[PDB]
Design a protein around this ligand. Structure first.
Ligand SMILES: CC(=O)N[C@@H]1[C@@H](O)[C@@H](O)[C@@H](CO)O[C@@H]1O
Ligand SMILES: CC(=O)N[C@@H]1[C@@H](O)[C@@H](O)[C@@H](CO)O[C@@H]1O
Ligand SMILES: [Mg+2]
Ligand SMILES: [Mg+2]
Ligand SMILES: [Mg+2]
Ligand SMILES: [Mg+2]
Ligand SMILES: [Mg+2]
Ligand SMILES: [Zn+2]
Ligand SMILES: [Zn+2]
Ligand SMILES: [Zn+2]
Ligand SMILES: [Zn+2]
Ligand SMILES: [Zn+2]
Lengths: 215, 210, 215, 210
């Protein structure tokens, strides 16, 4: 049996209510009358944590803000008065038959818009003294999570050899961070001298530019 | 306090074998329904195996994908259970969680990493990132497999820190961390990047020099 | 210095390989160059028998199916083509410092799965004539090892005064046997007439039941 | 043929004393490093004491928990060693093995049981278990201490026998055994249970009558 979750993502303002749905391909009603449906929350960097079992039974420790409902093949998790710590991926699961999970629903917290603090770093002497070259760019504490990063070498865009990494939403301030690493051969790196990390974000009308020149 | 701590994970060659364990405390183990659940980019959360109540004769059931290859085990008097895996495949790779309780799946451990490889284990190169208020960095490049632990000033420096999830490319991982302090702080006070990579028994300190 | 042995239980199929670990809280390497790590096997009903000494040296009479390896603080016992005669408890020990032992690993032989043969026995004339009453029930040659026995007197369950005992795994057929003894006072025994031994095992959706009627 | 036989164990009251012995043959005793090792459900196997080579002048060492209470001794000319135990505690209870060889711990005896008590030694009652192909039984009830020896037709009948380990309840052991034969065997051929309990000096034979 498959369980389908919607929506894939869910933006919500603090204090507001949120609603998730998870659908089974078969009825979850066991022959013994009970419906074995679970809701979990997986906060960033942590394992899943049981919220609700048997459809609407709130597990020990779970705030009454979380409530389960539904029957047959249709179930819903409601969160009223969303706190920032609520963010993460929500999962439903059925153990009426052989255990299966939903694909999860990521809850995102709405906030006021924040420009990224951008910082660029040339390869370290240590790395260079090993025949390698990595240019690194941090784009920290921004919102919304949509951001476009370009690497420009001598004005010309480079997409090969880029490694991007995002942090999950930080419940502390509800922002996002990002790291972009441009890796080149030592010889290629020394063939140019202008290096640029370029971010396009809602918070700025023009590209947010951070550059350095070699020598 | 309820605690589920996994252990024994790591790197294995395809066709290889591996045993992972879960140590339980804070609840009456013999009464508890236990599970192994694994997580991966593909497939997401997928149930692996279960071992039931003593009341229920410690009955075991396995996902069809691991049936005959994985053996689940438990010792109630030791509050311990294990997953002993054989003929491991690339898609067995994932984060393995120990889960259990009087209420099924009531508790979950931090998980242990199971990676079936062929790739060889490599220590990371640790590069200091000095700036061109002030933001410093640490680049951790070319290590296999996961995980590494990165810290600043042995943990003493934690606020203003952003550490990013490792990303794999050509059989190698790279990791980065940034820390933002005030101009009055550095280079006045030394700031040093600490990285451990158990798989290859490496612990590296890199001081951020202007 | 502690020797941590893993795992506690090791189910393996005939012909397959089994691997056992024991780990020391300190290096087992002695300043004289030698590492004094032993492996033992204790078969059911017998004393521990030395398999390997000095990390990898087989003792006389030990088949080279058993092999030891490792160094420093990490050691492994390997058994290829496991034979049923291999079943029992394996121990490591070190005598580099004050001698200590691992907690053992029980090797269990996998086999098909068998339902128990159940036999119930009324109190003997001899016991009754002495004022005592014991009802006995044998559950023989079953697999796997977990099993539930419920005693019913006149349809009602009776759990106090029950004595249970399991044999170790039998290397002849790889099964287990169990004895359950319900002890009542004679008067209490003669106050009822229906006595039931109820065996719930993995091998059947319903219990194997055995009973007798006084009179 | 190397042989090690322990003896002299048994039941003693807490605070009591006891001496056990090991007799050897089949090897040059004086060349042998000898040990005493005990085993119990709790603690498992613990090294107790050692006595070294003649070459090492019979030097002796003790586990810290028995230091000062136990004395290990040997006589090479008699291929014999002994362990004198004083002020025994409940946790001194267990199976004591004699062990030794040119190679340390190469050989092990059958062990001898040391049980420190308070509980009173008690003769068992042996009851024949006749049936309601065919399975017969023998119940050995209310004895102390361990062990008893149960045999069928004096050990003639070994195939199809299941002897279950004594279980202790309220200072008293009960032991049982079953034997399964073919319908054409019994009751035509007699089948009898033989039980010995040295501690109380009882030898009894119970014939199973239809
Ligand atoms: C209602 C219930 O307990 N169902 C269980 C299911 O959870 C799972 O344990 C399966 C074996 O994997 O057996 C049953 O079908
Ligand atoms: C290598 C060696 O001889 N070690 C012995 C150890 O075996 C044990 O005899 C102990 C005294 O109990 O002394 C030494 O540490
Ligand atoms: Mg309330
Ligand atoms: Mg409320
Ligand atoms: Mg449940
Ligand atoms: Mg200690
Ligand atoms: Mg048998
Ligand atoms: Zn260098
Ligand atoms: Zn079990
Ligand atoms: Zn210690
Ligand atoms: Zn009654
Ligand atoms: Zn040795």
């Amino acid at each position: 049996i498959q369980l389908t979750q919607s929506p894939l993502s869910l933006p919500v303002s603090l204090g507001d209510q949120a609603s998730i749905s998870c659908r089974s391909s078969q009825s979850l009603v066991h022959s013994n009358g009970n419906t074995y449906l679970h809701w979990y929350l997986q906060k960033p960097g942590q394992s899943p944590k049981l919220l609700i079992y048997k459809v609407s039974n709130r597990f020990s420790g779970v705030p009454d803000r979380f409530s389960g409902s539904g029957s047959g093949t249709d179930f819903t998790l409601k969160i009223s008065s969303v706190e920032a710590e609520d963010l993460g991926v929500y999962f439903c699961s059925q153990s009426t038959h052989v255990p299966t999970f939903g694909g999860g629903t990521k809850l995102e917290i709405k906030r006021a818009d924040a420009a990224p603090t951008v910082s660029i770093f040339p390869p370290s002497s240590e790395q260079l003294t090993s025949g390698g070259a990595s240019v690194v760019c941090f784009l920290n504490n921004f919102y919304p999570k949509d951001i476009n990063v370009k690497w420009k070498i001598d004005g010309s865009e480079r997409q090969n050899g880029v490694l991007n990494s995002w942090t999950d939403q930080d419940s502390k301030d509800s922002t996002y961070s990002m790291s972009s690493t441009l890796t080149l051969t030592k010889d290629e790196y020394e063939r140019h001298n202008s290096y640029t990390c370029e971010a396009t974000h809602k918070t700025s009308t023009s590209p947010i530019v951070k550059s350095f020149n070699r020598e | 306090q309820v605690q589920l701590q996994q252990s024994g994970g790591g790197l294995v060659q395809p066709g290889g074998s591996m045993k992972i364990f879960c140590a339980a405390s804070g609840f009456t183990f013999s009464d508890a329904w236990m599970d192994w659940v694994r997580q991966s980019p593909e497939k997401g959360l997928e149930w692996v195996a279960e071992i039931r109540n003593k009341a229920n004769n410690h009955e075991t059931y396995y996902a069809e994908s691991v049936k005959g290859r994985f053996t689940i085990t438990r010792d109630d008097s030791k509050s311990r259970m294990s997953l002993q895996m054989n003929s491991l495949r690339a898609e067995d790779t994932g984060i393995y969680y120990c889960s259990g309780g009087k209420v099924r799946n009531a508790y979950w451990g931090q998980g242990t990493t199971v990676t079936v490889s062929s790739k060889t284990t490599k220590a990371p190169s640790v590069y200091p990132l000095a700036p061109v208020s002030v933001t410093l960095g640490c680049l951790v490049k070319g290590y296999f497999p996961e995980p590494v632990t990165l810290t600043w000033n042995s943990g003493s420096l934690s606020s203003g820190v952003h550490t990013f999830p490792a990303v794999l490319q050509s059989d190698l991982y790279t990791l980065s961390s940034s820390v933002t302090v005030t101009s009055s702080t550095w280079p006045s006070q030394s700031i040093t990047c600490n990285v451990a990579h158990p798989a290859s028994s490496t612990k590296v300190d890199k001081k951020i020099e202007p």
